[PDB]
Amino acid sequence: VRRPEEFSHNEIQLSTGVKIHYVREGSGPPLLLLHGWPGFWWEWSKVVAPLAEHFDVIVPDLRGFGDSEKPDLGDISQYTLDHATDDQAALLDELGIDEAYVVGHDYAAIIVHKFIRKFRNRVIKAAIFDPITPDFGEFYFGIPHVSESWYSQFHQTDMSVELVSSSRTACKIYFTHFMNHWSYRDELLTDDEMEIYVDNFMKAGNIHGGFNYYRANLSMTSAPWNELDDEVTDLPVTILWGQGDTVVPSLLADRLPKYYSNYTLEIVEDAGHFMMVEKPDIVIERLTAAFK
Amino acid sequence: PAVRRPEEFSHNEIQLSTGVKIHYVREGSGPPLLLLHGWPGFWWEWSKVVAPLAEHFDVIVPDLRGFGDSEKPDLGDISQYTLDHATDDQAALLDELGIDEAYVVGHDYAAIIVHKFIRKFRNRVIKAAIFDPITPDFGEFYFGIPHVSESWYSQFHQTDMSVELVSSSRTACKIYFTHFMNHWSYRDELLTDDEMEIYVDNFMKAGNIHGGFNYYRANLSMTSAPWNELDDEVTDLPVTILWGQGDTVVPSLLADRLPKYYSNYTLEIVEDAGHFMMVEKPDIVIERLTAAFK
Ligand SMILES: [Mg+2]
């Protein structure tokens, strides 16, 4: 287990008005790895050094997460996924990168979906794990998947922030459920690993900032998708799907042709929602091979 | 120390033909009147209306199985937490008290219990009243869009983590339940802090958190069917319906569904009341029940 401090840390101010934290190492074509919720850059820790043999690996914290800036926590409008998508192109800008390989899942599955249609000329190839497409809502908020999406509505309440942040123990109890339930195997993280997550989420504004994503993009009056996002894209895309993902299940894969005309699909039977945590060997091999 | 303390009632615990030990308080002289709580709650949610009602009724206020000081059936066996069981418990309690027929009042989970009781045990009801009723119709709306913004908690309770988090301390327990007491109420703050501490005292008892959540696992999981073909019966029992317009979880726009199941009822929408009519507007409860049950 390679700890957060055993990485090379950076912080820069982007044109989008927000300060973004990221780690970086390796040499080669740029490779941007984007986390979701629950998460922050460190969820990719198992795969950074191996990929750094072939890529300039760049792993930022999304705004509202990790050590990146939390916009005014009372301003839900700064937590749209469109903002976080613009943050990624502005990061490449600030680093003098013309185009990059892009990888995302969970919330970052939407960012990548948006990114390669709005910033097509900034992406070489892309990969998405357990992708989420504009037609996801009808299922996600439907019967019986409401059994799984309840947390998105929990996070609209002020009491959710108050309860989850009431102590380290309450924080660990809450987040431990999603890491395991959304995973193929019964226990995803070692206790020490989970403790590093609690360290992260007990940072000022991180519980609140993460829930604002749900208030900004998954409320009953939220409209996070754009007309642009309905475009079929012919970008070469690598799709991996964890058959164990209970919240974004692999059966939704029959919807990919609605939006992608040139993709590979691999359903991993013994993986769930966190491919880079549970099956890092696979993430490493397929990205190295797909990205030349 | 500003409301009738829970110690200041006449308590009794009784084993029933159904196999559970039921706890209840009782006082008053008159025709019998059974008052049934829901979630979050226990017998003491009716405490503001018991003594005023006890001047004309024989008030009987039990803890539902899984709640309060009533027995928790095996917590790993959700089959013992269906609303059919809790309805039978009410008849079993009348039996054990020598009561042939009673006035009956229910809301929330007890709104369902009453719906079933007045159809299966019509022989045992004089008249009934339901606050913010819940009909067999309910699921399509409760789990529909956008009400999933309000029913998330029913699915939260399916998880093991919900029990682990909410029982983690008095603080967590109080933060959690405070949300529902207030959010489901017309006014911003339903309970005084001292009243809330009594609620926390109750839910920090062994199995009261787990047991309450089991009602959601037995009756409101996606594989549940708590309703029966009988419950589709249209009943002509005279039913008093009071509806809090500020109720966010069982909203009063649902009143158009009542004729589907009731042919002899009164309806009054209370503008400045929410999900807990007997807590937020105790006077209306007292005045309406005493008027209807004469
Ligand atoms: Mg699992």
Numbering used by the authors:
A (entry chain A): 12 to 303
B (entry chain B): 10 to 303
Quoted passage from the original study:
Isobutylene (IB) is produced on a large scale by the petrochemical industry and is metabolized by the aerobic alkene-metabolizing bacterium Mycolicibacterium sp. ELW1. A gene (ibcK) encoding a hydrolase is in a putative IB catabolism gene cluster on a ~222-kbp megaplasmid. The purified protein rapidly and stoichiometrically hydrolyzed IBO to MPD with a specific activity of 29 µmoles min−1 mg protein−1. The crystal structure of IbcK was determined at 2.29 Å resolution, revealing a two-domain structure with an α/β hydrolase fold topology at its core.
The crystals diffracted to 2.29 Å resolution in space group P212121 with six monomers in the asymmetric unit. The α/β “core” domain, residues 1–146 and 229–303, is composed of an eight-stranded beta sheet connected by α-helices. The adjacent α-helical “cap” structure, residues 147–228, consists of five α-helices spliced between strands β6 and β7 and oriented perpendicular to the core domain. The two cap domains interact in the dimer, composed of helices α5, α6, and α7, burying eight hydrophobic residues from each monomer, again characteristic of a dimer interface. The active site of IbcK is in the cavity between the core and lid domains, as in other α/β hydrolases. The active site residues described for EchA are conserved in IbcK. This includes the three active site residues located on loops of the core domain: Asp 117 on the “nucleophile elbow” between β5 and α3, Asp 256 after β7, and His 284 after β8 (AD1 Asp 197, Asp 248, and His 275, respectively). Electron density in each of the IbcK monomer active sites was built as a glycerol molecule, which was added to the crystals as a cryoprotectant. The glycerol is positioned with two hydroxyl groups within hydrogen-bonding distance of Tyr 162 and Tyr 225. Of note, access to the active site is blocked in each of the six monomers by an unidentified molecule. The electron density was modeled as poly-carbon as a placeholder (chain K, residue UNL).
